[PDB]
Each structure stands twice: as structure tokens, then as C-alpha cells.
Amino acid sequence: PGQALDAVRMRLAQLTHSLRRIRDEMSKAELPQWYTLQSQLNVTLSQLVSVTSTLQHFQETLDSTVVYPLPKFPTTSHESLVTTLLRKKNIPEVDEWMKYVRETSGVTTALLKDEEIEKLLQQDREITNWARTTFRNEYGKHDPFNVDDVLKFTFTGEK
Amino acid sequence: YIQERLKSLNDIETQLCSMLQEASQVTFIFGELKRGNESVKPQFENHVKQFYERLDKSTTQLRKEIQLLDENVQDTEKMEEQLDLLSAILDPSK
Amino acid sequence: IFKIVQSRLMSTSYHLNSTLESLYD
Amino acid sequence: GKSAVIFVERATPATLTELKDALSNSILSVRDPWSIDFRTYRCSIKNLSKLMYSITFHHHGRQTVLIKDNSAMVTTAAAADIPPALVFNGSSTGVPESIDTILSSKLSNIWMQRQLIKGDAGETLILDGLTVRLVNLFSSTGFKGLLIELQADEAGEFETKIAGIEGHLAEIRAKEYKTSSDSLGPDTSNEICDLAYQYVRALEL
Amino acid sequence: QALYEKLEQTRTILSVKLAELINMTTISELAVATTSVMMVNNQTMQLIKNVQDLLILTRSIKEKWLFDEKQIEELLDNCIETFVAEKT
Amino acid sequence: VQQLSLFGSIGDDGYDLLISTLTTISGNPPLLYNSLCTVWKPNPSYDVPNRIKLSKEVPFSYLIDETMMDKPLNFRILKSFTNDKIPLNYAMTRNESCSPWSLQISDIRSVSMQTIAETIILSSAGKNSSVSSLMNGLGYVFEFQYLTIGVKFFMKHGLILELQKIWQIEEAGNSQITSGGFLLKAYINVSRGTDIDRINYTETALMNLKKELQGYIELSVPDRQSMDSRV
Numbered sequence: 001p002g003q004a005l006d007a008v009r010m011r012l013a014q015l016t017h018s019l020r021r022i023r024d025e026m027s028k029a030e031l032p033q034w035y036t037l038q039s040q041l042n043v044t045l046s047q048l049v050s051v052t053s054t055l056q057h058f059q060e061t062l063d064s065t066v067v068y069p070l071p072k073f074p075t076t077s078h079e080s081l082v083t084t085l086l087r088k089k090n091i092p093e094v095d096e097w098m099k100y101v102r103e104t105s106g107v108t109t110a111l112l113k114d115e116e117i118e119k120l121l122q123q124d125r126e127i128t129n130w131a132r133t134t135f136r137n138e139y140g141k142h143d144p145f146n147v148d149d150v151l152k153f154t155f156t157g158e159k
Numbered sequence: 160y161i162q163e164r165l166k167s168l169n170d171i172e173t174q175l176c177s178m179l180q181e182a183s184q185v186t187f188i189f190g191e192l193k194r195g196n197e198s199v200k201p202q203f204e205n206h207v208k209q210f211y212e213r214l215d216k217s218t219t220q221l222r223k224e225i226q227l228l229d230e231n232v233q234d235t236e237k238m239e240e241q242l243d244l245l246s247a248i249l250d251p252s253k
Numbered sequence: 254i255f256k257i258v259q260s261r262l263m264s265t266s267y268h269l270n271s272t273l274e275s276l277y278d
Numbered sequence: 279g280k281s282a283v284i285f286v287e288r289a290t291p292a293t294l295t296e297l298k299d300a301l302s303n304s305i306l307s308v309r310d311p312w313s314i315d316f317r318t319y320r321c322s323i324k325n326l327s328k329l330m331y332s333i334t335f336h337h338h339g340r341q342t343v344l345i346k347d348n349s350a351m352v353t354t355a356a357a358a359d360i361p362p363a364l365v366f367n368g369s370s371t372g373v374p375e376s377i378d379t380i381l382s383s384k385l386s387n388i389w390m391q392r393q394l395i396k397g398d399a400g401e402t403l404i405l406d407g408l409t410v411r412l413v414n415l416f417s418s419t420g421f422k423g424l425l426i427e428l429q430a431d432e433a434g435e436f437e438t439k440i441a442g443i444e445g446h447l448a449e450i451r452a453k454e455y456k457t458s459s460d461s462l463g464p465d466t467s468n469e470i471c472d473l474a475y476q477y478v479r480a481l482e483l
Numbered sequence: 484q485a486l487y488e489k490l491e492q493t494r495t496i497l498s499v500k501l502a503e504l505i506n507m508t509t510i511s512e513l514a515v516a517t518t519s520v521m522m523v524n525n526q527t528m529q530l531i532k533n534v535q536d537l538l539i540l541t542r543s544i545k546e547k548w549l550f551d552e553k554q555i556e557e558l559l560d561n562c563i564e565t566f567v568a569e570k571t
Numbered sequence: 572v573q574q575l576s577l578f579g580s581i582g583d584d585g586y587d588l589l590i591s592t593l594t595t596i597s598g599n600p601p602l603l604y605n606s607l608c609t610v611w612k613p614n615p616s617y618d619v620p621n622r623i624k625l626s627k628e629v630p631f632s633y634l635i636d637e638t639m640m641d642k643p644l645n646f647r648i649l650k651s652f653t654n655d656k657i658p659l660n661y662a663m664t665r666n667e668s669c670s671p672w673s674l675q676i677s678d679i680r681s682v683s684m685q686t687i688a689e690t691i692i693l694s695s696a697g698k699n700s701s702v703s704s705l706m707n708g709l710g711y712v713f714e715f716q717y718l719t720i721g722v723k724f725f726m727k728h729g730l731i732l733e734l735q736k737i738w739q740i741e742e743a744g745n746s747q748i749t750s751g752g753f754l755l756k757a758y759i760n761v762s763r764g765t766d767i768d769r770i771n772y773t774e775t776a777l778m779n780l781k782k783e784l785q786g787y788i789e790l791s792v793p794d795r796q797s798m799d800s801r802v
Contacts, residue, residue, distance in 0.1 A: 022269075036535075042273075043528060049266065050517050056259065057511040068254030089257045094264030101516065124197060128510055131192050131201075135506065138184055142177035143499070144751045148578055149794030154748075157610070157622070157715060157802055160654040167488060168547060171495065171540075178498055185506070204508070211530070218541045225544055234584030242551065248565055256513070263513045270520060321710075323619035342690075349700065349708050351669055352693035360691045364673065367604045367628035368723060368733055371675045373572025373760035375688025384676055384688070388619065463696040465668075 002067055008059060015052040018045035165226060172222040179219055182212035279436020280469030281429050282443075283476045286455035289424040291414050293452075300449060301403075301410075309402030312337045312411055318483075319344075319381060320392030330389060331483055332378065333474070337400075337411070342377045343471075345478060348462060352471070353377060395422060407431045408439050429469065456480065487543075494536040501533035574677070574760035575684035575773060577792035579784070583650075586734070586753045589787065590646075593724045593732065601722030601734050603645060605629055611706050612714035612802065621800035623711040624674050625702075634658050648720065652736070656747030661716065661740030667700030679799060681774050683792060687760060714802065716740055719749075721756070728776065732757040 002008075022042055056063065069087065076083060091098065113120075145151070150158060186209040189201035224231075298305075312335065319330040327347045334342055341354040354360055355374045364370045382391050400413030408430040415423045430439050440459070458479040466472050491497075505526040509518070552558050581589060594600040611623030632639060635658045640648070652658075672692045677685035695701065699708035707713070718740065721733035733756050736749030759773055781790030 019265075043525065046269065046273075047521075047525065050514060050521055053263075053514045053517055054511075057514055060256075060511060063254070063256030063259065066254030066256060087258075089259070089261045091257075092261055092264045094261070094267050097267060125510055127192075127195075128197075128200065131188070134188055134192070135185075138188065139181070139502075141184070142181050145580070145748070147793065149797035151748075151797070152793050153797030156797060156799065158797065164484070165547065168544065171491070172544075174495055174498075181502075204506075208506075211534075215537055218537055221541065222544060225547060228548075233587050235588055237588065239550075245561070249561055252564065252568060260513050263517070266517065270524075273524070323617060323710075348698040349695070349705050350697060351672075351695040351705055354691040354693075356691075360673075361671070363628070364671070364691065367606050367626070368721065368731065369604075369606050369626045369628060369673060370691075371572070371574075371687060371689030371760055373574060373675070373687050373689050373763065375572070375675065375690055375763075377690055380676060380688055380690065384678075463700070465696055467696075468694075 001070065002062065005059075005062065005067065008056070011052050011055065015049045018048055021045065165229065169222065169226055172219070172226075175215070175219050175222070179212055179216040182209055182215065185209065279430055279433045279439065281473035281476075282440065282457070282459060283425070283427050283473040283480065284455065284457035285415075285425045285477075285481050286423045288453065288455065289414075290421055291416075291424070294412070294414050294424050301446065304405055305403040307402075307404045309404070309409075309411075310338065312400030312402075312413060313398050314400070314413065315378070315394070315396040316481075317378065317391045317395075318393035319385075319389040322388040322390065329483070331478055332381075332391075333477070334378065343474070345462075345474070350462065350471075397425070407435060427473065429473075491536065491540055494533070494540065497536055498533050501529050501536075505530055572688060572760050572763040573684045573686045573765065573770075574758055575682050575770070576756070576758045577682065577777075577781075577790065578754065578756055579788040579790060580752050580754050581788045582752050586649075590649075590722070590734070592787075593734070597724035597726055597732065599725035601646070601724050601732075603648065603720060603722055604733065605634060605718075605720050606735075607716075607718035609717060610713065610715035611711045614707050614710050614712035615714070616712075617710065620802055621676060621678075622714045622802050623706065625672050625706075626674075627670070627672060646722065649722075652747065653750060654747075656738050656749075657740070657745045658738075659740070659745075661745050664703050664713065664716075666702035667696065667704065669695035669700075669702040669705060672702065677800070679795060682777075683795070683798070684761075684770070685798075686763070688763065728759075730757060730759065730776075 022045060025038060025042075072087060074080065080087070110117075146154075186205050189205040192198070193201075314336070315334040317332045319332055321328075321330060330344065330346050332342070332344055334340060339356050339359060341352065341356060341359055343350060343352040355376065357365070357370070357372070357374065360370065365372060378391070381389060395415055395417050397413045397415040400411055402409060402411045404410075405428060408428040410426060410428050412424075412426040414421075415425060417423075428439070428443065430436055458476045460475055460479060461472050462475050505522075508522050508526050511517075555562075590601055605628050607627060607629070609625040611625070613623065634640075635648070641651075669692070671694075673690065675687055675689035677687035679685055695705045697705075699705055703713070716739070717737065719735050719737035721735040723731045723733035725731055735754045735756055736747065737754075738745055738747040738749070761769070761773075777790075784790045
């Protein structure tokens with residue numbers, strides 16, 4: 001089951017390693033350091049989570065078929081109940097924030113229309129598209145001197 | 160060598176006029192395709208676009224006052240050493 | 254369903270999303 | 279035709295004083311005494327004319343030069359023979375060095391002097407239009423020879439001058455020693471330089 | 484400074500890059516909720532990044548900056564007793 | 572001949588004083604003598620330290636070639652050149668007859684004096700005739716090249732001080748290191764290994780000026796690691 005599914009996990013490990021450094025820098029507070037460097041080094045390590053989040057969507061047929069938990073062997077007699085909410089995943093408040101995605105879903109919405117309203121959603125996106133080929137088309141429009149020693153070492157040639 | 164560096168300085172300064180101004184013709188065509196239900200999409204962006212980049216036209220007013228600072232901006236003081244001889248000649252008679 | 258273990262690690266993104274956003278202030 | 283020179287590997291200091299009597303008809307004035315040296319700098323470098331040669335001569339002062347495989351230049355230890363303008367750039371050291379105290383003592387690792395010989399207290403006598411000075415040499419081998427010089431004012435009379443040298447030298451009633459008349463660069467601009475090739479080349483060095 | 488040219492003309496390329504992927508703000512389930520605040524942060528990040536390269540280059544255009552006389556009293560009072568106490 | 576030396580520097584503007592304060596205090600004003608010191612390693616590929624050196628002083632029309640250098644003068648070259656630093660690109664290596672050229676050698680607790688023994692020259696010719704060829708042909712091939720000017724003021728006991736500025740000409744173009752101000756130099760080249768009791772009276776005439784000169788700019792001598800001709 002998923003001979004190549006583990007090579008996806010080592011790429012979850014490469015992306016998880018983006019958390020490693022990040023969180024050990026959190027504790028590296030409260031003494032202040034290198035906002036530019038860290039911020040860019042935190043942002044850069046975040047992006048890849050989405051790009052391993054991306055390389056997962058090509059494999060999205062196996063998170064749908066889901067490949068799912070045939071997988072639990074160990075018999076961890078109870079104490080894996082914490083590995084059970086852990087194996088469990090499911091949705092956190094982030095779900096409480098998913099319905100905030102549902103009230104941001106706002107209206108809308110179905111029950112709203114069946115089709116021809118939807119075909120006015122797709123015909124609603126596609127016209128945002130053409131405004132962008134009018135965009136790229138107007139874009140290409142404008143597109144003290146060192147201590148004398150080193151100078152005597154420069155009389156030695158030294159730079 | 161004050162000219163080459165203020166030469167690249169108004170040679171990067173004119174690359175900001177092709178910078179803040181293309182933030183104009185960016186807002187324009189957003190009102191032509193406009194008049195639609197959702198035509199307020201470009202209104203959160205364009206209006207965050209030319210609200211944001213229109214303070215990059217503030218930074219284009221500081222450049223020329225630097226090259227107007229070239230318009231707007233031997234070797235001794237030893238004249239005060241004629242304060243030094245001066246005290247001496249007042250010293251000779253005093 | 255190997256997807257739902259990754260939707261709570263989507264939720265691992267939000268606490269970094271709002272902690273990165275509350276950093277922005 | 280203002281210069282030339284020659285040497286002998288067979289002779290003695292007691293054959294040095296003789297030719298006076300028969301040349302005492304042509305000698306008007308005995309000028310000031312010269313002196314000299316010659317030595318060979320053997321480069322200690324590995325492999326790769328590989329023999330470097332040096333010499334020195336004092337007639338009212340001194341100066342030095344070297345020649346290896348047809349490439350040469352001239353030098354000095356002196357401030358007069360050096361335009362004072364050389365010291366006007368301040369460029370001049372004023373702390374002039376023996377070149378043979380420069381190369382032998384400073385350069386001892388690679389080129390150390392591999393040969394030394396000379397002869398001293400030279401003199402002058404005046405042969406019309408071409409002077410004649412004379413001195414003898416002594417090797418490590420005992421007495422190694424004798425040597426003398428001539429310099430002509432007029433260039434065109436240089437054919438009768440080289441003709442008149444062996445004609446008072448046929449009366450030598452003595453055995454051969456030879457010379458070179460050659461010029462290094464086809465240029466040969468210096469009446470000073472071109473008797474040094476008739477010197478090193480005719481010393482067979 | 485030829486390196487302010489190489490970085491801040493790669494920052495010019497950055498104004499060129501900053502207008503690029505931002506307006507580029509584009510039109511999966513979990514990851515397409517992802518990419519939507521991914522550019523609110525990384526389009527506007529890089530937007531405060533050329534806003535920061537706006538400031539860096541806004542105020543670093545600025546780093547391109549780099550008597551007892553007592554009037555004539557103690558002047559002409561001692562300008563006489565100098566010379567008329569000189570010759571007289 | 573063992574000679575001793577040291578140096579210091581000050582702004583361009585407060586060099587107006589120092590120049591006529593080297594006229595007031597020295598009894599002589601600074602005077603211009605152009606000096607270009609060039610380098611040659613021994614032929615670097617030999618393999619079986621002091622690099623080869625050279626110098627000269629040169630047509631005033633040849634140094635600055637622009638309108639005879641904007642009309643004639645003596646000290647008018649003082650305020651003229653900072654980043655304008657190439658009067659000549661060096662015309663590469665230059666130098667088949669060699670013209671007059673010269674050199675010397677100097678090797679290494681108050682002060683420092685190197686044993687400096689010298690020499691001079693006249694001209695070259697032949698197979699490898701020229702100055703570059705009879706240089707690497709002597710077994711020493713070019714490492715680098717250097718140049719400068721100077722303004723000197725005569726003094727007691729054969730003492731002279733030349734305020735100088737230098738340039739460096741090469742493959743990538745030539746530029747003057749005189750940048751940031753002006754320089755000065757003074758020396759006494761002794762009779763080789765001359766009396767050290769004159770090497771205790773050589774310092775103390777210089778101590779007058781060293782702690783007299785201390786305070787317009789300090790009097791101090793530069794590092795030895797940088798002193799050796801070693802490459």
C-alpha cells in the first residue's frame with residue numbers, strides 16, 4: 001500500500017523540518033533578533049508546506065480513496081487513545097473557523113440556485129480572467145587609508 | 160565621482176516614474192470593465208493598489224530635492240591665527 | 254482520509270497564520 | 279671605429295714591460311692608472327648561453343654591466359655618471375652598492391660568483407687618435423697573461439688603426455694571441471660598449 | 484557602491500518582481516483555502532518587501548548626503564595703535 | 572648602506588597650511604618630482620623575498636597630456652587629481668633599447684633601518700633587447716607596476732621631505748591610491764653601516780620633529796610584516 005506513499009512522508013518530514021527551526025526560534029525569545037533574516041527564513045520555510053501541500057494534490061486520489069487507516073497495527077493498549085485523537089486528526093476549532101468560512105461563505109447561496117446561478121459563478125470567474133490579458137498587455141508597456149603597514153605590505157603587493 | 164553615483168541615483172529615480180505611474184494605468188482599466196456585480200473585486204485590490212502605490216509617488220518627490228540639493232547644497236580658519244598674531248601685537252604693547 | 258489527518262495539519266497552518274498575523278501587528 | 283681590445287693566455291709580467299722601447303717613439307704622455315676585475319656568476323638554478331659573466335673597470339671612476347646570450351644593459355656605482363636629475367626625482371638612493379657586493383652577498387643562494395681573476399695598477403700612453411693603456415692578469419693558476427686597449431677619435435681611420443696594431447705587433451717576434459672586432463646589435467652605438475664584446479668574446483667566454 | 488546597484492537593481496527587479504506575483508494574485512480543497520491567504524501574506528509580504536525596499540531606498544537616498552572682534556571697536560582701536568604706535 | 576625611515580598623513584584642506592608650514596618650518600617649500608616605481612617578480616615560473624623594481628622621471632608633456640595639462644604651473648597638480656587618477660593608462664608595460672632605469676636592495680628599540688645598497692643604468696639591445704624582455708630575460712618577470720609624484724622641502728643635515736600621491740596601472744585599468752588626502756616621506760641613506768652614534772643622533776633630530784610633528788599629525792613608524800619586500 002503506497003510503495004511511493006512513504007516518499008511522500010519523507011517530503012512531509014522535509015516540510016515538518018520547517019517547523020523544527022521555527023519553533024525553537026520562538027523559544028529563542030524574548031531577546032530580539034534579525035527580523036528581516038528570520039521573517040524571511042520563517043516565510044520561506046512556510047511556503048514549502050503548501051508546496052508539499054501542493055505535491056499532495058497530485059496524489060489527491062489517495063487521500064480520497066484515502067488509502068486510509070487499514071494502517072493501525074500496534075495494539076497500544078489504551079494509551080494510544082491520545083494517539084487516537086492523534087491518529088484521529090479530524091477538525092479542530094479550525095473547524096470552528098471553517099464555519100467562519102461558512103458564514104464568510106455568507107450569501108449566496110444554495111440553497112440558492114441550481115445551476116444557472118452556478119453557471120453565472122463560472123461565467124463570473126472567467127470574466128475576471130480576460131481582464132488579466134488586458135493587464136499583462138499594458139504591463140509590458142514600461143517594462144582613513146589603511147595603516148601604512150598594509151601599504152608597505154602593499155609595497156609587498158598585499159591588497 | 161559625485162556625478163556617476165548621483166547619475167545612477169537619478170537613473171534609479173526615473174525607474175520609479177515607470178514604477179508609480181504604471182500604478183495609474185493599472186487603476187484605469189478597472190473602471191472600464193467595471194459596472195458589474197462583483198466589479199468591486201478590483202476595488203479591494205486596485206484601491207489597495209493605488210492607495211498603496213500612491214505613497215510610492217511620495218518617495219518620488221524626495222529624489223529631486225536631492226538633485227535639487229545639488230542645486231541647494233583655503234581651507235583654513237587661519238584668519239583666527241590673525242587672531243593669534245593679533246593677540247601677540249596687543250601682547251607686545253600691553 | 255489520509256486527507257483528514259492533513260486537514261488538522263491545515264489547522265497547524267492557521268495557528269501559524271494568526272500567530273504570524275498577530276506578529277504583523 | 280672608436281674602440282677595440284685583446285688578450286693573451288701565454289705571456290708573463292716580464293714580457294709586459296718590454297715593448298716600451300720600440301713603442302717609445304709613439305708615446306707622448308703617460309696618463310693616470312686604471313684597475314680592474316672579472317668574474318662569472320653561476321646561477322644555481324636547475325637546467326633549462328647559460329654562463330653569466332661579470333666585469334668591472336676603473337679609469338677615473340667605475341661602472342658595471344652584464345651580457346648573456348646577446349641581451350645586455352649598463353649600470354653604475356657613481357653619482358656623477360648618473361644624472362643628478364636621477365636624484366632629483368629623489369629616485370636615487372645615494373647609497374650606491376658594489377654590484378658584486380650586491381650579487382655575491384645578497385644573491386648567494388643561486389648565483390654565487392663561480393670565477394674570479396684580474397690585474398691592477400694599469401697605465402696610459404698616447405697613440406695619436408687612439409690611446410693605448412696596458413695591464414697584466416694573474417689567475418689562480420699563477421701568472422695568467424697580459425692585456426691592453428685602444429680608442430680612436432676618427433671613425434673612418436679605424437681601418438688604418440687596426441692595420442697599424444698588428445704591424446707594430448708583427449715586430450712582436452712572438453706567438454699568437456687573438457681578438458674579436460664584432461658588434462652585438464647591428465646598431466653598435468657605443469664606443470664604450472663595443473670593446474667589451476672584443477673582450478668577453480676574445481677572452482673566449 | 485556597485486552592490487547597491489546589484490541588490491537594489493535586483494530590488495528594481497524586485498519592484499519588477501513585486502508587481503509580478505502580486506497583481507498575479509490568482510483567481511484542491513484544503514490547499515485552495517491555503518493559497519488564498521498565502522498571497523494575502525506573501526503578495527503583501529513581498530509588498531512590504533518592496534515597501535521595505537521602498538524605505539530602504541527612500542531614506543538610503545539620504546545616505547547619499549555624506550569671534551572676539553568687538554566689531555570694529557577692538558578692530559580699528561587696535562588697528563591704529565598698531566600702525567600709528569608703529570610710526571610716530 | 573643602512574638607511575632609516577617613517578611617515579604620516581592629513582586631509583587635503585589642512586595640507587594648504589602644512590605645505591607652507593613646511594615652507595615656514597623647513598626653510599624650503601615643497602617641490603615636484605615625479606616617480607614611477609614598477610615591479611617584476613623574478614620570472615615566477617623559474618623554481619630553483621625581494622621582487623624586481625624599476626623607476627624613472629619623465630616628460631611633463633607625457634605625464635598629463637591634456638592641453639599640456641591645462642596651462643603651465645608647479646604646484647597646480649595638487650588640487651587637480653583624485654578620481655581623475657589616470658593621466659596615462661600606463662600604455663600597458665612600455666619599457667630594442669632600454670632607457671635610463673635603476674634599482675636597489677634593502678633588508679631588515681626606537682626605529683627601523685634597512686641595509687640598502689644601490690645601482691643605476693643606461694641602455695639595452697640585442698636578441699631580447701627591450702626593458703620588459705631584458706627584465707624577464709634577466710630571469711625576472713613582471714609582478715606589478717606603481718607610480719607617484721612628490722613635493723619636497725630641503726632641510727638641515729641633508730634632510731628632505733617629499734609630500735606624495737600614488738597611482739597603480741594594470742590590466743583592469745589604472746587608479747590612484749592617493750585617495751583620502753595627502754602623504755609625506757623623508758629619509759637618510761647612511762654610509763653603509765655608518766656609525767650608530769650617528770644612528771643615535773639620526774633619531775634625536777627626528778625626535779624633535781616626531782614630537783614636534785606629533786599633533787599636526789602623529790609621528791609613528793609602520794609594521795614590519797608589511798615592511799619586508801617579501802611576496
